[PDB]
A paper describes a structure:
The transcription factor and tumor suppressor protein p53 is the most frequently mutated and inactivated gene in cancer. The most frequent p53 missense mutations in cancer are found within the DNA-binding domain (DBD), where all mutations result in lower target gene expression through the loss of DNA-binding affinity.
The overall fold of the p53 Y220C-CL is comparable with p53 Y220C–PhiKan083, with a root-mean-square deviation (RMSD) of 0.383 Å; however, there are several differences in the small molecule's binding mode. The 3-positions of the two carbazoles face opposing sides of the p53 Y220C cavity, where the aldehyde on KG3 forms an H-bond with T150, whereas the 3-position methylamine on PhiKan083 forms an H-bond with the carbonyl backbone of D228. The p53 Y220C-KG3 crystal structure presented an opportunity to enhance stability and labeling by creating a new series of compounds.
Residue numbers in the entry: 93 to 289
């Protein structure tokens, strides 16, 4: 699909940018859970996934935090990741996300969606906001709108989520990522995938 492949080099940058996650466990009723051993997130479709951000020092004002997805295996990394024909046309859009965009940010009125005219890649970016009073990290609530097994979509192809911090003018301050598997039963899948280890 695309003419380039985005760099995935994890890079902490001058502010020590990194991502954190909750310790949800693999109970049968969790809406998302992170496998530290897989560095892979297991979640349901369109259910809320909180991701935390951490920095050490003060970043410049007007900073924006952007998410993107790319297929994991070397032979698929140029295909743009998008919702499958069925899901794209499900008319459950929230009123902001492009109906073909896989990743939504939930509960933020300053979200921004981009279809990249040269890479053709979809991405969602929001403003960077400091941790609530008392807290020490920033939580962003993401959603994934297709199952990993969607034919015509990923079709069971693993994917990475690449989160990049950028300044107001759009330049890179740090990057981090993780793989993702979307299914209806994320606790059991996480359990089983760690077993196979
Ligand atoms: C863009 C969010 C932000 O400005 N921010 C965060 C986010 C998450 C964890 C910590 C943290 C900050 C810490 C400081 C000062 O040390 C300044 C801005 C921070
Ligand atoms: Zn689908």
């Amino acid at each position: 699909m695309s003419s380039s492949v985005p760099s995935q080099k994890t890079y902490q940058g001058s502010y020590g940018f990194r991502l954190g996650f909750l310790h949800s466990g693999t109970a049968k009723s969790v809406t998302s859970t992170y496998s530290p051993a897989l560095n892979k997130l297991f979640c349901q479709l369109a259910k809320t996934c909180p991701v935390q951000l951490w920095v050490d020092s003060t970043p410049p004002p007007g900073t924006r935090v952007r998410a993107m997805a790319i297929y994991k295996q070397s032979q698929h990394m140029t295909e743009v990741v998008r919702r499958c024909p069925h899901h794209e046309r499900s008319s459950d859009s929230d009123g902001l996300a492009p109906p073909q965009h896989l990743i939504r940010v939930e509960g933020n009125l300053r979200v921004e969606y981009l279809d990249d005219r040269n890479t053709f890649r979809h991405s969602v970016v929001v403003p960077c906001e400091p941790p609530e009073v008392g807290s020490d990290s920033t939580t962003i609530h993401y959603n994934y709108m297709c199952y990993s097994s969607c034919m015509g979509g990923m079709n069971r192809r693993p994917i990475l989520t690449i989160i990049t911090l950028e300044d107001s003018s759009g330049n890179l301050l740090g990057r981090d990522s993780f793989e993702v598997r979307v299914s209806a039963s994320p606790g059991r899948d996480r359990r089983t995938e760690e077993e196979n280890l």
